[PDB]
Write a protein that binds this ligand. Sequence first.
Ligand SMILES: *[C@@H]1O[C@H](CO)[C@@H](O[C@@H]2O[C@H](CO)[C@@H](O[C@@H]3O[C@H](CO)[C@@H](O)[C@H](O)[C@@H]3O)[C@H](O)[C@H]2NC(C)=O)[C@H](O)[C@H]1NC(C)=O
Ligand SMILES: *[C@@H]1O[C@H](CO)[C@@H](O[C@@H]2O[C@H](CO)[C@@H](O)[C@H](O)[C@H]2NC(C)=O)[C@H](O)[C@H]1NC(C)=O
Ligand SMILES: *[C@@H]1O[C@H](CO)[C@@H](O)[C@H](O)[C@H]1NC(C)=O
Ligand SMILES: *[C@@H]1O[C@H](CO)[C@@H](O)[C@H](O)[C@H]1NC(C)=O
Lengths: 317, 172
Amino acid sequence: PGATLCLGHHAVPNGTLVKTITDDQIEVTNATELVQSSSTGKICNNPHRILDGIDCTLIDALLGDPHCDVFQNETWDLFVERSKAFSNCYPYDVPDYASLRSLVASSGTLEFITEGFTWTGVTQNGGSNACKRGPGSGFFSRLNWLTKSGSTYPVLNVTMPNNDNFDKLYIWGVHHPSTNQEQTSLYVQASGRVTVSTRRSQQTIIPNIGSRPWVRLSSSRISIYWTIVKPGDVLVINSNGNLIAPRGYFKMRTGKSSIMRSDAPIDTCISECITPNGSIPNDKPFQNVNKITYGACPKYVKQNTLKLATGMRNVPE
Amino acid sequence: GLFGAIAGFIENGWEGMIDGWYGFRHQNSEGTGQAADLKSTQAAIDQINGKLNRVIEKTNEKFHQIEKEFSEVEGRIQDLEKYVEDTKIDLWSYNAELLVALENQHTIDLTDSEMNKLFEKTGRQLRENAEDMGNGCFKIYHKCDNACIESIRNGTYDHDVYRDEALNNRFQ
Ligand SMILES: *[C@@H]1O[C@H](CO)[C@@H](O[C@@H]2O[C@H](CO)[C@@H](O[C@@H]3O[C@H](CO)[C@@H](O)[C@H](O)[C@@H]3O)[C@H](O)[C@H]2NC(C)=O)[C@H](O)[C@H]1NC(C)=O
Ligand SMILES: *[C@@H]1O[C@H](CO)[C@@H](O[C@@H]2O[C@H](CO)[C@@H](O)[C@H](O)[C@H]2NC(C)=O)[C@H](O)[C@H]1NC(C)=O
Ligand SMILES: *[C@@H]1O[C@H](CO)[C@@H](O)[C@H](O)[C@H]1NC(C)=O
Ligand SMILES: *[C@@H]1O[C@H](CO)[C@@H](O)[C@H](O)[C@H]1NC(C)=O
């Protein structure tokens, strides 16, 4: 006599909860997770060139602390500083440490070109038991500690032109002796002075004599400065004492290089996105692993989970 | 949802239907049977895949950035670095929260819409040979063997063939 045709929709025993505009929990048939919340704990060695600092900070590799000599002329996409890193050379500070670290990290290279500086009337290649290199006394490989010859330290006055088509980074310093005896004993003059200049800029540093805390055999210190010299410009260095001279320049690049603090081991896998906790996949648009990231990464968010519905409302019996 | 099919005039879903998202159950002289509708199922799936793929489009690659953790107290510049990153994270967290809420609201409404569209399409095939019982079932007022049911499900059912037979059963 007749028939019935009933329209319906599917359902599942195993529903998932999601949020909407109106409900902060509602059951749907399926959903996918948009927040990456885990890592394997390892930094993947591809596709980015990872350089492990091991015992060395980037600055210590730049200056050339002897236990960091293996980093000479190194390059990286991502330099990794470890929390166990230590200095083992002459004790120093860098006014605006953070900026030098940043600019070097971002350049992505420690390529060093030695230049033929002439230091007339002074003794070169000074060293210290604070900075052992092999068994005997030594110094930062990229710096040249100048002291008196015989019984005089004349006014040094040298020039180095940039005739190349790239920017040159010069790292140099000033020695701050701990006593007046030390000052006169090394530089003759009672008070030193270092003036480094280009056409565009000038820096003049006066050393300060006094005791600082004893660190690796010394109450004295070196302060590190830097100067960038552009194509067609010139470097001039003028000092009557306390100059820690450059041996040359670092080559500057622009690119995608950076630096990260992490204790995660480097391992063999492929991942575009790196965090201090390890590499993470980037198939999801958000992540809750770390606000610090490098590479093609999901965006950091506070939520540890956000579910996108990939099915209808689940309505069982 | 906005259409009142799912969790509305259709009391519940069918855990039984494993071959698709929407479909038909019938009873005739020859017994019972169940079959998924492919077009409705596929239209929902395509729409959901579309939004899924828009949401997961990789669009963020950053290299050298600001520092975000600090070992020393410094004051003003550091306060600003932290505030910049904290501001950014709160805005992205908000974006992510709203995105899923909007998307999920829409996913519920579009799947409800597809249920309702299949129901209205089926009612339009049946013309005056059936009536809406009010619960997502059509009472068909004629002999409808498994060839007849299959013809409704596959879009060929010709209502004229049975109109006389069914008009009679409806008004008697
Ligand atoms: C210490 O070293 C600097 C750098 O070598 C010396 O600067 C030079 O000073 C001379 C003057 O004695 C400048 O000479 C002038 O050169 C221009 C060329 O454009 C010429 O047209 C002028 O007639 C004049 O001769 C020279 O340009 C300048 N060098 C640079 C690179 O700027 C400085 O004199 C030295 N000072 C001492 C006290 O030894
Ligand atoms: C990634 O590493 C950081 C620590 O380096 C972890 O963040 C810490 O998490 C706990 C809370 O669970 C807090 O006590 C710390 O203060 C957090 N640190 C910071 C800087 O926010 C984080 O849990 C790690 N994440 C994963 C997935 O391993
Ligand atoms: C549902 O989502 C999960 C992951 O979120 C996926 O692995 C699974 O294959 C999906 N199942 C269906 C039936 O779509
Ligand atoms: C570093 O690079 C330059 C050439 O760019 C080379 O002359 C120099 O000897 C290199 N030094 C080391 C220690 O490899």
